[PDB]
């Protein structure tokens with residue numbers, strides 16, 4: 635065993651160094667000067683000379699000076715199973731879902747109405763306010779590790795911002811959608827064609843492909859965006875409602891949509907659906923529908939979920955744009 639202070643110092647220094655290596659090489663966006671970084675690395679190298687067992691092929695020093703940053707899409711489990719959503723395509727279907735909800739929990743349920751973004755699902759995990767893992771949906775229990783790629787998304791903060799009202803959770807699994815804005819999708823296609831590459835047929839395909847890059851620097855060069863729309867496993871945070879949960883996401887620095895509204899009953903839900911039916915074209919990214927969710931966490935627990943989806947939510951899908 636190496637002495638505890640030595641090990642502590644090495645770990646801390648190596649992590650700080652690797653982070654700047656990632657920020658400089660992958661993102662082309664350093665956050666400390668070249669001089670500052672150089673002293674940092676010099677120090678890590680000194681520590682390793684004094685204790686050569688610390689020099690490993692994985693060290694930011696011994697091996698990885700050019701880069702060692704590749705995504706391999708290895709399977710990684712979600713903390714809580716990621717489900718899909720049941721759909722409704724007609725007024726009748728939606729009313730039937732509402733009725734079922736009424737029969738189980740009466741008039742105690744309110745409905746959060748969110749815009750359904752037609753992108754790529756991404757699950758992020760923050761441990762003690764720090765981003766540790768990001769993965770794809772996969773089969774729901776297990777997805778693919780695209781942590782490095784997710785680290786290049788501007789909207790995804792590496793660290794959560796501490797706030798008076800909302801303390802940083804011990805563990806936070808937050809779900810969101812990754813997408814391109816329409817103008818950015820066109821721009822990307824033009825750039826791809828300029829290099830002799832095939833363009834993407836649609837923004838969803840384009841987001842998926844941009845996200846899933848073995849080399850995260852490719853992802854860093856593209857304007858991916860992310861909007862959080864849900865919660866998985868959480869520790870140190872017990873929001874009464876989804877809407878209140880979104881306020882904490884905001885305080886912490888996570889990206890959330892400004893188009894969400896809280897309806898009190900089905901008439902309110904119906905109004906939002908009719909409204910976005912008329913105005914979804916004005917949003918700068920693709921919206922295929924409206925997701926209706928029982929807002930009260932306790933009611934969500936009661937209603938539960940099936941193996942494939944929540945009973946407490948439903949996606950009202952429009953006709954193709």
Ligand SMILES: Nc1ncnc2c1ncn2[C@@H]1O[C@H](COP(=O)(O)O)[C@@H](O)[C@H]1O
Nearest residue numbers: 717718719748749750751755863925949
């Ligand atoms: N606001 C949203 N809330 C929940 N899920 C959303 C939202 N927007 C997009 N989605 C995605 O919609 C997926 C289910 O969609 P679908 O299979 O088309 O019915 C989710 O699993 C999410 O990844």
Ligand SMILES: NC(=O)c1ccc[n+]([C@@H]2O[C@H](COP(=O)(O)O)[C@@H](O)[C@H]2O)c1
Nearest residue numbers: 654655658664665666667668671699700
């Ligand atoms: N400002 C930075 O964060 C940063 C990080 C990594 C490398 N670099 C620059 O690139 C070279 C350093 O060696 P590495 O190639 O591991 O990073 C030096 O020119 C260094 O200043 C800068």
